[PDB]
Design a protein around this ligand. Structure first.
Ligand SMILES: CN(C)c1nc2c(Br)c(Br)c(Br)c(Br)c2n1CC(=O)O
Length: 327
């Protein structure tokens, strides 16, 4: 399988663009940035609001836990390649502690409101607007030969007063090389695409489109997360209960894949459930026919059949967002 778009971007840019292991970091000055308060954390870092002591502007400081040189350079080189792109978080500086050699990445500040508190507030229009802004970022990174591999609401910072949106957490982003087999242990469980769950390794940018699909389903149906599985086998079961098993079987056969025997058994046999079956009184102001047609063209077992980020931006669901931009 190969990407249907931007397949050869890396193939014929100069090697330096994608050979992240040859990167040499230019270190800034640690004393330029002071920690103000803790704001978040992950398996790989603790994250602080900071201050730049020169201009007194806010920033974000990501203090990394011990990490292998290869891994960190992949993250840096990706951030540097994409810095300046629409709605990509800007990496402004990279510094380190002298004694411990502990690195910190310094980013622009976004005054985020936690999605679990923010999303219930959004209007139908705001949902279309923020999803369009996210699409701009995905088409951009895809066009530069990079898969993000971890799209989910936790990784999308939004200053709602400024109506600004940044895609963050590039810790799992990778360069796309046609026919390469990738590790399927990427993304976060509720947002993993069926190609990850059935061990199809030569995936591509379309993985991100599934994850965006899950986030969008969660927003319009007010069911977070939309596919609530407990481990990776159960995650494919939860998807098959909605998309139905006939379509799963077409996909596996098209790509010559045999599910593990016990996985076959947990999956069973299920009818496809129409998307209207999730509508209820609380969400009905969000589940209109353009929303469902758009969702249905992202949540497809077959990665090659999903909309590209560029085609998604043109879908009639976004027309008023485009009109306002054309002003
Ligand atoms: C816990 N993590 C990873 C994290 N939370 C973050 C938040 Br809230 C903001 Br605002 C920004 Br800017 C970054 Br960078 C964050 N990072 C780092 C990142 O997104 O790369």
């Amino acid at each position: 399988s190969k990407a249907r778009v931007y397949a050869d971007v890396n193939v014929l840019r100069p090697k330096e663009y994608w050979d992240y292991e040859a990167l040499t970091v230019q270190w800034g000055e640690q004393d330029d940035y002071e920690v103000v308060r803790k704001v978040g954390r992950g398996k790989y870092s603790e994250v602080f609001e900071g201050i730049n002591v020169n201009n007194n502007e806010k920033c974000i400081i990501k203090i990394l836990k011990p990490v292998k040189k290869k891994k960190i350079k992949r993250e840096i080189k990706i951030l540097q390649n994409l810095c300046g792109g629409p709605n990509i978080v800007k990496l402004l500086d990279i510094v380190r502690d002298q004694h411990s050699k502990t690195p910190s990445l310094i980013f622009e500040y976004v005054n985020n409101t936690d999605f679990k508190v923010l999303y219930p507030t959004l209007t139908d229009y705001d949902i279309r607007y923020y999803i369009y802004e996210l699409l701009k970022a995905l088409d951009y990174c895809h066009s530069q030969g990079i898969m993000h591999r971890d799209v989910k609401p936790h990784n999308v910072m939004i200053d709602h007063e400024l109506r600004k949106l940044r895609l963050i957490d590039w810790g799992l982003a990778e360069f796309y090389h046609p026919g390469k087999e990738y590790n399927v242990r990427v993304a976060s469980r509720y947002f993993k695409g069926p190609e990850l769950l059935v061990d199809l390794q030569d995936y591509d940018y379309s993985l991100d489109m599934w994850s965006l699909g899950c986030m969008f389903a969660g927003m319009i149906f007010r069911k977070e997360p939309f596919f609530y599985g407990h481990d990776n086998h159960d995650q494919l079961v939860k998807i098959a209960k909605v998309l139905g098993t006939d379509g799963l079987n077409v996909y596996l056969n098209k790509y010559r894949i045999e599910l593990d025997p016990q996985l076959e058994a947990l999956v069973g046999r299920h009818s496809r459930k129409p998307w209207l079956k999730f509508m209820n009184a609380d969400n009905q102001h969000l589940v209109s026919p353009e929303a469902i047609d758009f969702l249905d063209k992202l949540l497809r077992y077959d990665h090659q059949e999903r909309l590209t980020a560029l085609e998604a931006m043109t879908h009639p669901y976004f027309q008023q967002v485009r009109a306002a931009e054309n002003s």
